Short mmCIF file of C-alpha atoms (C1' of nucleotides) in Angstrom, two decimals:
data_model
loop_
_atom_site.label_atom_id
_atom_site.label_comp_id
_atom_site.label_asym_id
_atom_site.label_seq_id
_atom_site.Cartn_x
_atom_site.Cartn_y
_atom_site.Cartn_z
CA UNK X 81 110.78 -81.79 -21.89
CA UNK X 82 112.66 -78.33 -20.91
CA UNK X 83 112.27 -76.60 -24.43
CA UNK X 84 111.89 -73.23 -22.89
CA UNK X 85 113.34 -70.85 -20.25
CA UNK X 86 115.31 -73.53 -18.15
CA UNK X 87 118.23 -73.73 -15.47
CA UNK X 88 120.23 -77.14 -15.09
CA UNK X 89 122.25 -77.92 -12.50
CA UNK X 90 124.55 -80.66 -11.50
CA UNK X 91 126.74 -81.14 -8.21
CA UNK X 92 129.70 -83.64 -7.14
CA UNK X 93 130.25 -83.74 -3.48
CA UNK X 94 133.67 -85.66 -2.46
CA UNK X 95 135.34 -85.72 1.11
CA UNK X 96 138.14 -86.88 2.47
CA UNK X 97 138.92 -86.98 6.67
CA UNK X 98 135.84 -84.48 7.04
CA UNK X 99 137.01 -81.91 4.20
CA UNK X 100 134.54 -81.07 1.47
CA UNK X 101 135.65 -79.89 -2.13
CA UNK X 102 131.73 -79.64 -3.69
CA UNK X 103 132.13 -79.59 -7.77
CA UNK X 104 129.44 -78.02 -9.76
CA UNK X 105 127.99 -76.76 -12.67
CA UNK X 106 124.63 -74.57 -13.84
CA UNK X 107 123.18 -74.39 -17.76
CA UNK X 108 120.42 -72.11 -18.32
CA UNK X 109 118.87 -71.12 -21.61
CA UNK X 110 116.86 -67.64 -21.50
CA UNK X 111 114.52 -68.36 -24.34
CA UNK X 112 113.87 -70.83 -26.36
CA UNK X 113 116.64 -70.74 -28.60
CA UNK X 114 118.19 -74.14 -28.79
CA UNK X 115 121.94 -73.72 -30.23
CA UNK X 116 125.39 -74.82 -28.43
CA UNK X 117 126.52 -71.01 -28.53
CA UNK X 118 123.17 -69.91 -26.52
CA UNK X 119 124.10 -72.02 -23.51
CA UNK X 120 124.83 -70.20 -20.83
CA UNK X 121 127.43 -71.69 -18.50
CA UNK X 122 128.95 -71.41 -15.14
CA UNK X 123 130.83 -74.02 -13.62
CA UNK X 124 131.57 -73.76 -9.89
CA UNK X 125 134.83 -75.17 -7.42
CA UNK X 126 134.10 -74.96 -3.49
CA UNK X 127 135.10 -76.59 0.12
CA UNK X 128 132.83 -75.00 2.16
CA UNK X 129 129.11 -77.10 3.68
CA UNK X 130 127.85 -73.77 3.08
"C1'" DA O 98 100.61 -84.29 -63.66
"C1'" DT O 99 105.33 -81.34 -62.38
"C1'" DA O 100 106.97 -77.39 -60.65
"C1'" DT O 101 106.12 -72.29 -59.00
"C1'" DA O 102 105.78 -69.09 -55.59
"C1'" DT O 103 104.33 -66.87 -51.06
"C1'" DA O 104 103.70 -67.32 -45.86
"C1'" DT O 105 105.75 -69.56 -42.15
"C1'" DA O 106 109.08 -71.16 -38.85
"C1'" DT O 107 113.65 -71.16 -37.04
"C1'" DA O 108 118.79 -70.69 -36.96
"C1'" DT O 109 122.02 -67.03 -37.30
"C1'" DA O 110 123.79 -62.31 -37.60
"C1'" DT O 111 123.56 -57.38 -36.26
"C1'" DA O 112 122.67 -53.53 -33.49
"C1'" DT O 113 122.99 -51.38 -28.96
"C1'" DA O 114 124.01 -50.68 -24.05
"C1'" DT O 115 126.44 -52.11 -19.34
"C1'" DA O 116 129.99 -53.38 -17.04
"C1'" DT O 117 134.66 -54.98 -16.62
"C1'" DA O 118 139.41 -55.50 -17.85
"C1'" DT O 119 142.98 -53.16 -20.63
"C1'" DA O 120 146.77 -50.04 -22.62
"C1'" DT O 121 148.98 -45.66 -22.74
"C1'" DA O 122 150.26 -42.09 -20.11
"C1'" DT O 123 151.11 -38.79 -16.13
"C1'" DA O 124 152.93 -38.10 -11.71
"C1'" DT O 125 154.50 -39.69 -7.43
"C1'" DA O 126 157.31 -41.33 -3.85
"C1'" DT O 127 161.43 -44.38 -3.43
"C1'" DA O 128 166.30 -45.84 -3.93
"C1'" DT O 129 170.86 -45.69 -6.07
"C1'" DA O 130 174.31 -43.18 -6.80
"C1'" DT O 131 177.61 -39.00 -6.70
"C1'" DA O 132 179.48 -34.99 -4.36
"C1'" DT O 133 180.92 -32.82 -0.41
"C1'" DA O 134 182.99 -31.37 4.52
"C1'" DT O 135 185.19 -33.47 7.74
"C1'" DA O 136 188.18 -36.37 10.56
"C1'" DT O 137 191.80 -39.74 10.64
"C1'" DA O 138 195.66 -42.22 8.72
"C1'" DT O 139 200.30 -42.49 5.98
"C1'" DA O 140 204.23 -40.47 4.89
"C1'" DT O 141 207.77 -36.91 5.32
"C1'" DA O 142 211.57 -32.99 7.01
"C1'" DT O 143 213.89 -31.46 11.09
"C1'" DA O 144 215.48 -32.36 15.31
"C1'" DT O 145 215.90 -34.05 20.20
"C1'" DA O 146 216.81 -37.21 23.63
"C1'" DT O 147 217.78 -41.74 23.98
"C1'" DA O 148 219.61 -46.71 23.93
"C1'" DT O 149 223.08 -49.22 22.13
"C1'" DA O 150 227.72 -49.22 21.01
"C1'" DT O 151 232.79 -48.19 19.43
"C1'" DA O 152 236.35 -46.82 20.81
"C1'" DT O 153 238.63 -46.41 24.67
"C1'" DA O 154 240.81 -45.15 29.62
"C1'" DT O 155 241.76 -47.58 33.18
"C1'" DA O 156 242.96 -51.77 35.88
"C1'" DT O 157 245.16 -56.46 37.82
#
DNA sequence: ATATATATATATATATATATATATATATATATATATATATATATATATATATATATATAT
């Protein structure tokens, strides 16, 4: 379904007593190669609504 | 008929540039440490004035 230029993106939001701590993730391919080492990651840590 | 060979697609490697993090190195400002002049303490010779005292005069 996404063969092409693409961006993924997933996002755990957990709380405790009022205090976020958001985990996170993007995956993008650039073109329409397909192989593990073409992924492009970033992976993302926050506590902040923002 | 089986197998051959070229054109095609796709997965991988290579080249090149940008930016960042790195290693080696220079120089800097900082701190430890040593050296010094100086003042103060410890000990001493020489001697005085002193307290304690023997030796002692004097007394009952």
């Amino acid at each position: 379904a996404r063969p092409g230029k693409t961006v993924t993106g997933i996002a755990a939001t957990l709380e405790r007593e009022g205090k976020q701590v958001r985990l996170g993730a993007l995956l993008w391919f650039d073109s329409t190669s397909s192989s593990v080492t073409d992924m492009k990651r970033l992976w993302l840590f926050s506590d902040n609504p923002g």
